[PDB]
């Protein structure tokens, strides 16, 4: 209605995660936009880069000026990469507003496994102490008393939800775990380079990143918050279509079915972006494209239990988050403005 | 331009995919000579109202389901039939002494009782045409059983590891993905474009009947497997794309000399070990098989591209025709 307005800012708005999370914040009832950050499209309306949008957001982008928006905002969505997002983060914590950092920059706990990953330096080492992961169904004890939260992978999201509780529980072994991941070439964000061109993306499909992409350490540092230490082994695939992640997980159970739905549908009882099946039921990318929802099948031959876990990569995975991590640390319900 | 050693070869039920693809093919082989193109739906029409891409290519009028007539002016015959017809068919050819390639599942697995099947006496006598693999079983025979496309990106990367012993039979996993020209030329809702475009998803959990095929054939090698096969649908017309997960205790160029090895004189096997990655398009339109290897510790990961329509099906259907007529195997394909 209005009553607990808040000002929202967007730092990289003009990216396609800003695309998704402006669409929400527009139609949000209590978050108000104050300021659209792009040094690159500054002094267009975002509705020039994004006509879809005209006469729904049309706010002038403005340019990097982070005094200005810590004075008109009490909450800034950072879509930054490395490095700047930790000076811009570390900047708008200490001026008191809430944050949401979309980068890998205060992800891991560990700095660094952190600085080998990413190559790059962490120079903020008490603020990392202090940051949140962002799963809002797992970890939502702590987001609700955070000020600033690190916003989880896309490719994390499909993986760890529906393995986190099933390892807490030990219903499934710790070892062994196989998640061969497939994205939309949306998760290479706005880009020109050539290899996410229109022509060599069309009709291909490829792995990438064979032991060596960034999400994988990810995935195990954040499992290992079940008490159990993992070696997931995660291999990603581009999928020649715009949005959607699938994620096929095979595991090791001694549990039967009717035990594994209960674990799951037990945990995220109350959460309603996590739509549980287990009745033959196969989740697609297009059931899940567009929305906020995780979907997630589960099928049990003797001990191996495959997960077919389906997210948006840029709405779950990303934007969505974004706004159920807000909602929850300004008091809102998750889903507000969400679903 | 006619060769010298022609031969006059037939295709039943010659409008879906597969027999687009195989015509394509057949067409510029300079030894095979297209006799009849059967199809009871489109009989009357040349091939290239079908297909009008190839208009004064192949313009053969279509003709019905009358076998005596084929059997009076072919030497070979290929059979796109689906179950049970495949197998009249099939046992009509093979008294009349034609060279027989038949598309279909009904004689892959020699073992009856997966079937559960007529013709048992046949059913003896059918070689499974990997040509990269039996070729010895395939010059000797007069009815192949083409594989299955998905087991050809999963059986060809695996069966020399097996062999030499370099990889663990238990607990491959194979998570794979096909264009949708796998479901061949349907009218069902589920392969229609509005339901796959844009649209990812596995299916046939523990269900797909290529994954018995898999581990039939692989147990040639010496070593019982249970290969795990999950198949996937990609939002695109034609390609294959397998991941296969081995434990190994080996080294990466110890893997690579044993297929490299092994595949040396075979012309569509193209093996990397250098960190390329194949992708679906590298292969898309050719009868290439990409095979990528990539070691870490103990953990050996394949990834295997094909043409689903072409290495999985039509190219190799001619590979196992030319073969068992005396020809090298890749003549009119590279
Ligand atoms: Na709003
Ligand atoms: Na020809």
């Given at each position: ?57 049309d706010v002038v982008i ?133 290899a996410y061109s229109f ?50 997980i095979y595991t090791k ?87």
């Amino acid at each position: 209605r209005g009553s607990h307005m808040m000002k929202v800012s967007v730092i990289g708005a003009t990216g396609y995660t800003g695309y998704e999370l402006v669409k929400i914040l527009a139609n949000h009832p209590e978050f108000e936009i104050a300021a659209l950050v792009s040094e690159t499209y500054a002094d267009k309306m975002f509705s020039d880069v994004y006509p879809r949008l005209r006469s729904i957001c049309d706010v002038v982008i403005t340019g990097r000026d982070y005094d200005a928006v810590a004075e008109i905002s009490d909450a800034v969505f950072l879509c930054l990469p490395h490095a700047a997002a930790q000076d811009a983060a570390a900047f708008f914590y200490e001026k008191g507003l809430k944050v949401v950092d979309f980068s890998a920059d205060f992800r891991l706990k560990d700095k660094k496994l952190y600085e080998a990953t990413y190559k790059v330096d962490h120079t903020y080492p008490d603020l990392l102490r202090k940051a949140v992961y962002g799963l809002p169904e797992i970890f939502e004890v702590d987001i609700k008393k955070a000020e600033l939260v690190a916003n989880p992978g896309c490719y994390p999201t499909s993986v760890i939800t529906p393995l986190y509780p099933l390892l807490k529980a030990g219903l499934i072994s710790p070892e062994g775990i196989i998640a061969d991941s497939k994205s939309g070439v949306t998760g290479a964000g706005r880009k020109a380079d050539i290899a996410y061109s229109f022509c060599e993306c069309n009709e291909d499909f490829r792995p990438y990143a064979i032991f060596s992409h960034r999400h994988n350490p990810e995935i195990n540092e954040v499992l290992k918050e079940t008490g159990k230490e993992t070696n997931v082994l995660f291999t990603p695939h581009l999928i020649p279509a715009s949005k959607g992640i699938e994620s096929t997980i095979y595991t090791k159970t001694t549990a039967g079915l009717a035990e594994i739905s209960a674990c799951l549908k037990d945990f995220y009882r109350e959460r309603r972006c996590v739509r549980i099946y287990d009745n033959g039921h196969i989740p697609s990318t297009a059931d899940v494209t567009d929305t906020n929802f995780i979907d997630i099948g589960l099928f049990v031959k003797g001990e191996r239990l495959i997960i077919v876990s389906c997210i948006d990569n840029l709405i779950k995975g990303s934007s969505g988050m974004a706004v159920q991590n807000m909602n929850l640390m300004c008091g809102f319900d998750d889903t507000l403005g969400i679903l």
